[PDB]
Structures are given as structure tokens and as C-alpha cells.
RNA sequence: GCGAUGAUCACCCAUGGGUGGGUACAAAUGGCAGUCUGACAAGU
RNA sequence: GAGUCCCAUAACCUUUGUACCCAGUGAGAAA
């Protein structure tokens, strides 16, 4: 059963939006007394886990850090720790500084968590899927059409413009040209291909994927081992070889 | 790009037909043809007071 | 004869020694005002000596006030005394070229050997250092004048206007700001925990309505139990025991993300009233009158959305938001409130006596409707 | 320096207090603390008349800063019982606002005490 | 209030007007997501997605230099990289617009001498970085001379009697040569004996006596009476 | 208008030949195949055209 | 035993019933809403 | 062959249900 694959890639989006809002706030607070820190660094967890490490200015110039933020920005952190425009907290909110840092720290923690989860089910309810196109994005692919049995019984033009729907009905309902990508854009072998023929290897992906994606919905001795999607990401990765050794110059 | 100048043409023909719009209003004159770089932009009045350009 | 030259500065003090004079009667001529724009021409006039930087900023504030004042430093005293030569004090000084009339004098003070120069001559010499800067001084000096020179400008006048970081009403403003924000996480996270645990039976979230003590039971609770005893934080406990012994409906991975959810939002919940706790306290000591007023939380969404305490302290009493008889009782809260704000803003250090007065005055307002 | 600094000496007071008086006969006085801050991010102000012994003093140090902000002489008067008795009310009054007008009979006398104010500020 | 308005460079660089049925005089927002004074924002969408960056409306009954723009002065020499020296930072109401015209490579040295309006100016200076506000009589400037190093533009928004001189000495301090020089002279806070055309003809003449070449002058009458802006170029060689 | 008789035009310059174009008496594919939409668009198209021609009849 | 430290302020019936609504939100398979093309292409 | 990375992961409306309502003013109020 896959009720809870749109539950949990619903949950990624949400989750991913609330990390975003929360570091904010949290470099907007420790910026009263360290401003320069997030803007020269500015990964949200490097963030919060370097203030959980040393918390104050002349504290970062008596300690030192190499498992967050790597071997380069140490010299500028050291810097704007010596000479700086921000202030000087105290205790009673540097402890409340402190929880949010640990608070988003253990956010994507959950995140991540939240990510192997969704590869487990994905790889558990629809495996060729995952072995052609990857987790997550089968994941939306079958939380946009709803079930696993009603993107399989969809062509593989649709499920080639699966995510682009309102350009596509814009540019059927006004005689234009339609899209070429849509969900399906953010897979790693469209992402490999260049140019037009990226536009190629999305329908060649989209047609072995929806070869792979009823197989797995359809078949009752299926052995969740990727044997079908593997033979078909072969075949959509020679193929892609195979236009991507051709070039338009002439020699 | 004009594929987004396909979209807000019709605003940019209001504004350099401003003149034309009510009756009372009367500017002074200028041409304005469309300039080569601009942006759309939506006024945000603020959560401070209410009713009056709400 | 303009012979030394002193150049304060962020990153320490610099002593140059003039080579060449330049003209004196010729001082407001063309070539003569545009030599110091020149480099090339201004390196014939001025050579770096000495310069000693500064331990730190808390050296840097030090000698910034005593520069600003007027008064000659330690660390000024240390390099004057280095550099200048012992010469007499009865017949020709030694010339020291300074920017500031009233800090020549504490230098005679300290050496009386030296005469100090400020005049227009020995201001454009300055001007010609502080225009070229880090050319003259031939990299010996760590860290960027510039960014020095952000920091002490903060510092000082941080210093000069007394700049309390305990009476900070942003750190309210951010405390509420995002105290709402993880009011709808909380919200919207266990509302997804009690639907993923709606199929293992749904009447946890009919008997046990709170987000929090749901949460909190239901991280422990994973199967049928009897043993109602550690349950109850047990009328309630008993019928959940009773609708366990009933369960009416339906794994091992899922039910294991479901349990780190729930302790997700367990987490959220006693960040929360962390945060609740935190900003009461800032409230008491950021607004006490407010506080003592309207309350702390209702006082912190009021200086939020006014956007600080100094904009509701400034905003007039007819148009404040506070959230017939009824009618009017905001309307007398309104501009109490805004007296309150004023006081609490505007004094220094404030006490509560205010905000009791102005609660006793809204409350015999309201007791005698 | 106190909080509440400008303050005026009683000749000064007494000026002060004399074409608040005329003022608030002629319609151009704007008398109370709100008021006050109304006409004073309105921008018809010639001066604020603060009184320095009110009961908090915050209450009315409030409007020095938006004084300041537009750039309108304020002067501290010493008592709030005479600037209420001045002002022609039944009340003390902790603060008042000169109003501009340009037909207005003491134009001349308000400019003086704009310029007495403005060289004690 | 909720409507929808083009957004326009102007002929200065780094100010811009929206035109709509009303047309604004705009600058871009170097701290997104607040007001500073109360005045209105516009909020673009600019193309990763697009982010929205935001605007602010630069009000010219709230601001001299807003009112000179619009006015039509030929050269600001506040300009997007710029140093500027504002001297009379009363609050952060013009500061803030003369910061994000100079944008975040320049800096604006923001002199106040209350105390205050300098509490104001530094809880503004945080969310702008590119603001050091100083905290010093003016009239003094060797007693934050530590503090500011060879800006491009002197803006003077005092409102003081002493004017000239305190222009004269900021200038010679802390201007380079052939820099800008705005001046917002306020004809009866200088002094109301005389008419406005003679305070300004003698300000203009202790400019000149002060070698700060004046290039133009601008009367901005329809948002303030008897004021002024003169703009000149320090020039400290050769007037003529 | 000028009506310039035929005898006349066809003996004109190459500058001075008189471009006039015969009208279309063929339904041709472009036109019968081109899409125009309805509604708040025929609306918006009625709108402009009031707009434009207000403000020329105005200058 | 007051107050400028702020008084005050969309339709019918002989307190109360009958006549329009809107905003600010929750559903929402009435909706907008309808999931591109189809046999060649690359090389020697 | 072919306009998504520019929010179909979105935007907006109508049959039904949930809570209010048709700020300024500036010397009066009470008997």
C-alpha cells in the first residue's frame, strides 16, 4: 500500500519550508551578536551547529572547529570574531539561541530520517520506479497522479509531462508549443543529457519508466529487487551514450 | 524577455495612455516609451494602518 | 619646520617624519593643493617611522574615547616616546604635526620638549595620509583599515549613547515572531500525528484532544497496554484503557517513523514554553509596565506589531490596537497602555509601580461599569 | 542633564505662557498630550509645550524624539497646572501644541517665542 | 494599496520610480520585510526560482534630499558605491534611503549628535550594515575623526545657524577633492530677520569662501517653504 | 481619395509605382486556422481599443 | 465626592419579532480541468 | 518534433457551514 508516500513527500515539502523559516530567525537572532557569520557561511545546520560549538566571539577566538565548515572559512570566521559590528549577548538568551540551534539541528536530522523512510516504502512499494528515476521523484510522480495503479495505467506521454500541466493546457489551448519536462525534469539521467536531447532522454525515460512503473503495479510475482527497472535504465543510459557521442560540428 | 513584454503589454499601454483615463486628472507631458529594463511590482501597504488605502 | 607627523587611526597610531616641507606661502596654490591628491609626488613629502597597532578593541574604544577627548594615552605616551628625540624645552622643540588643537596641549603636558602643530599646513598633511591610507604604510599593519574602522565606529557610539543589549526589545519582537510560527508547526505536525495514528485507533484524539499529552502518551503507548497506572499524565485513562481492550483498528517500520514524529513534535512542544517562559521574563525586564498592564504575551504581540517598543511608545494613544461599555474600556486601555509604553520606553531602567498604578486605575474603571 | 532638559527660566515661562493664553483664544492651540503627538506627525506645529513635573515624565518624553524628528522647537514649562490655567481648561495639562496659521493675529509673537526657544535648544 | 505599478530606473543612478496612475519616487530595499518609518513598499518577483525583492517609497513631504530629487536637481553625487558623510542623521527617515541608493559595496557615516534619534539610528544601522552611525556633535569633527576616512559625498541635513562652518570643517576633514556637497539650507532656522533669497545668497557666498564651488541651487517649494538645496563640488584648488 | 487612373500608374517610375494591394477573396488557411479567445479577453480587447482611441482623439 | 494623565460621538412593525447581506475562514469530482506528437533517426 | 525548473508541490472562484459589522473627533459629563 502506498497511502502514505503523498503523506510523507507532503511532509518533506512542509518540513523543508519550516527549516527554511526557522533559520532565518535563527541567523536574524545571533546576528545582534555575530553578524558576519551568516553571511559567511550560510548553510543553516553549519549555522546552528557552529553557535552550539563556541557561542560567543572571544569564545570562537580561544576554540577551534574542523567537523563544521570546512578547512577555508575558519581564517574569516576568525576575522569577524576579532573585529566585528555586533554586540555582546548575555546567558539568559544565548541559552535561547542554544535551543534553537539544537531545536533545527534535530529538524533535519528528522528530515533525513524522514528521507530513508521514504526511500524504504518507495523501494518496498514501487522498486523499478526507484531504479529508473530515482526515490523522491517517482515519490511525487505517484503522489501527483494519486494511486501507483492510476500512473500506471497512464501513456508515457503523460507521464513525460506529468508535472507541467498548466503550461501544457496553455499551450494546447493557444495553438503553441508544448512542454518537454515537466516532474520528470529533476531525474539524474536528464540531468546528465545536454541541450535538446535532454528533451530526447526524457521521453525515452518517461517510456521505459512507464514500462517499469505498470510492471510494478501490475505484476503478483514481483520480487522487489530492481530487475526490470535496472534492464531499463541500461537501456535509457546506452541510449543516452549513444546521443551524446554524436555531435552537430563537422570534424 | 519578450515572452513576459507578451504579458504585461497591456498594462505598459495604460500607463503611457494615462492621459486619456479620468476625466480629472491631467498630467504633465511626457512621451514614456517603454523602457528597456523594468520590473512589475505590487505595493504592499503594511499591517500598521487599515481602511484608509486598504 | 613641521618635522613629525602623528596619525591616529582604528588600527593603532602611526608616526611619519616630514622629509620635505611643503610650501608655506604657496599653501593655497594649485600645485600646491593638488601634490597631496598625487601619490607619486605626496611619498616625497611623508615616510613612515613607526606604528604601533592596537591589542585589540577594547585598546581600540580605549584610545578612540581618549582621542576623542582629548588626552593622551598610554599607548600614545609609549610611542611619542619611542619615536620623538629628547630635545630641549627651553630652545627649539621638536615639531609634532596633529590634527587636534585641544589634544596638543595634554602632549606639552606629557612632553614639554615638543611643540604640536595644527594649522592648515600640518591639516592637509594629515588629509594626505588619510587619503592615501594603507599606501603609506607599506603592509605592516593586520586587519583591513576599513572593516577596523566599522567596528569602532559601532563601538563607539554603542559606548557614547550607553547601547543596553538586556533592554532589547528585537530580541521580543523575534521571540513572538516565531513563537507563532512554531504555534502552527506544532499544530499542523500533530495533526498529522493523529491522523497516522487515526488507523491505530481513533479514539486517542476523541478522549485525549490536547496536541502535546496525545503526543506524549502515544510515544509510549505502541500496542495493547491493563497496567493503567504511569497512563494517567485516570478517569480519562481508564477509558482509553477500556477502548485498548476495544481496539477497532489496525505495522512495525511505519509505526517506528510514526513514533519519531511524535517525538518531533514532543520536541516542538517543550521548545515551546521554553520559548514562552523566556519571553515573559523578557518582558519583565524589556516592558514591566506593559506586562504588569495587559500581560506579557499580550504585550509582546503589541510591540510586535507596532514594530518596536519605541514606535508604540511614539504612536499616539487614539491609534493603538489593543486586542459602549465594552466599547470604551479599549478605548481607556488604549491610551493607558500608551502611557505605559511611554514610560516604560523612555526610562532608563524601569520599575513596575506604573504599570500597578495604571492597572488599578483600568480596574476601578472597569468595576465601576 | 536631566530628562526633562530644555527647560525655561520665568521670564521665558511667563512669555511661553502668555501666548499659549492668546493662542488658545484664537483657536491655534492644540492642548493635551495625544493631541499633541497628532499635530506633530500632522506637521501643523510651531512649537510643543511640555510641563516638566507631570507625574510620570516619560508620558510626555515621549515627543521630544518627534520633535526632533521634524525639526519643532519644544520647551519645557515648570508647571502643568499653570500651562493648563494658561490654556483656558478646567485641567492641568502636561503638554500643547502651537498650530500654524497664516491668518492668525499673533503670528509676530508666536515667531518670537519660536526664536527665544529655538536659542535656548 | 494593493495595486500594481512598474518599476523604472531613473535618470540618478540607483533610485527608480514606479509608475502607475500616481508615480512614485522608489528606492530598492537593502533590508527586505520592514518598514523603517511607516512608508509603503512594492514587492517584485525578480528571476533557482525568482526572489522577491522589495522597494521602498521615498516620501518627499518626509524627506529633503526625496524633494530635491524630484524637484529636479542635474547631479546628485550620492551615488550606488559611494561614501557618503550625512551630518544631521536626525533619524533614520533619510538615512535609510540614502543608505540603499548607496548600496551595500558603499557606506554611509551617519552623524547624529542626540541621543535617542542615535538609538534609533543604531537598531536601523543593524539590519544596514553598510550605516556606522557616529554619535558626535558635529561641530567637532576631530572628535570622531578615528572613526570616518575619505568620503565621496558630504550631505548636511543640520538645521543649524553654524551651518557653513560645520560643512567647511567635515569638508576639510573627510572630503576627497572635486566631491559633492549637498546642502539643505532651512532659511528661518538660520535666521528669520532677513528674506530667504539673501540667507541663501549668503550661505552660498561662505561656501564659496570656504572653496566648495556651488553648481546649482533648487528652491523645492511645493514640499517646503523657504528651503533650499544647494549642490556644489569641493573643489580646494581653483574656484575659477 | 485620389483615385489615379490605370493608364496612368502603369507608366509610372520605379519610385513612384503606387502600392495598392488587392483585397483577399480566398479563405485562406493562416486566417481560418488562427485562434482569437473570448470573454475577459474580447473584453480586455474592447477596453484597450476605447483607451487608445480616447487618448488620440484627445491629443 | 468627574475630565486634555482625554468628556463625547442596507427595508417593515405597536424591550422584542419580521426584510439584505458582506467580510474573514472549513469542505468542495458544481467548478476552472482538459494530461503532447507518433515512425523514423544516426553513421559508412 | 515539441514554452515547465518562473510555484498543478500552485493560483482563484462559487453551493454549504464559522466570528464580527453596515476608528477618527476634541470639552464635555453629571444634576
Partial sequence: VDVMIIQAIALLDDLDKELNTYAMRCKEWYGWHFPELAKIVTDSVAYARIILTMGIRSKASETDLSEILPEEIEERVKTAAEVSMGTEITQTDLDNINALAEQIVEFAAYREQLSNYLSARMKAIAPNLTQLVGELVGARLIAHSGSLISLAKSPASTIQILGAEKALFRALKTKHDTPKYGLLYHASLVGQATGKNKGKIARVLAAKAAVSLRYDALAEDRDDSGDIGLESRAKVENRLSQLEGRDLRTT | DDNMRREVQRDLLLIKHRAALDPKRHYKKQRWEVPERFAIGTIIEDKSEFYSSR | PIEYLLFEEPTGYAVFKVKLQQDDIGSRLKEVQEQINDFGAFTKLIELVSFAPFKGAAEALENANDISEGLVSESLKAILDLNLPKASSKKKNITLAISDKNLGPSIKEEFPYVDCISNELAQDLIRGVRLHGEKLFKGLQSGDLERAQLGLGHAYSRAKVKFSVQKNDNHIIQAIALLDQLDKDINTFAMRVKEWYGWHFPELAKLVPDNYTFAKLVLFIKDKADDSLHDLANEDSGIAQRVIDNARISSETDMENVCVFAQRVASLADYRRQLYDYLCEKMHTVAPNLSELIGEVIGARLISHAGSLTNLSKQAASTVQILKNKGRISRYLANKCSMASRIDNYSEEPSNVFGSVLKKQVEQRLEFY | ?121 | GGAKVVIEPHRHAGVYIARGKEDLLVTKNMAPGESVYGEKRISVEEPVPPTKVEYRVWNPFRSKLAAGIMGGLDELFIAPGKKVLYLGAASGTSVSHVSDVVGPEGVVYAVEFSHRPGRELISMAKKRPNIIPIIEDARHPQKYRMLIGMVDCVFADVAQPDQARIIALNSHMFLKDQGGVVISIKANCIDSTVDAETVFAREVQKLREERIKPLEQLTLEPYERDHCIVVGRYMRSGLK | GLKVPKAVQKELPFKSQIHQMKPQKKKTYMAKRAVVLGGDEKKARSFIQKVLTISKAKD
Fill in chain 4, 1 to 121: 542633564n536631566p530628562k526633562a532638559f530644555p527647560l525655561a527660566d520665568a521670564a521665558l515661562t511667563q512669555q511661553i505662557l502668555d501666548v499659549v493664553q492668546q493662542a488658545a483664544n484664537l483657536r491655534q492651540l492644540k492642548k493635551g498630550a495625544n493631541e499633541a503627538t497628532k499635530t506633530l506627525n500632522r506637521g501643523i506645529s510651531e512649537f510643543i509645550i511640555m510641563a516638566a513635573d507631570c507625574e510620570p515624565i516619560e508620558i510626555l518624553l515621549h515627543l521630544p524624539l518627534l520633535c526632533e524628528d521634524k525639526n519643532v522647537p519644544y520647551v519645557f514649562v515648570p508647571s502643568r497646572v499653570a500651562l493648563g490655567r494658561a490654556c483656558g481648561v478646567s485641567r492641568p495639562v502636561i503638554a500643547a501644541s502651537i498650530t500654524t496659521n497664516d491668518a492668525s493675529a499673533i503670528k509676530t509673537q508666536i515667531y518670537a517665542v519660536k526664536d527665544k526657544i529655538e536659542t535656548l535648544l
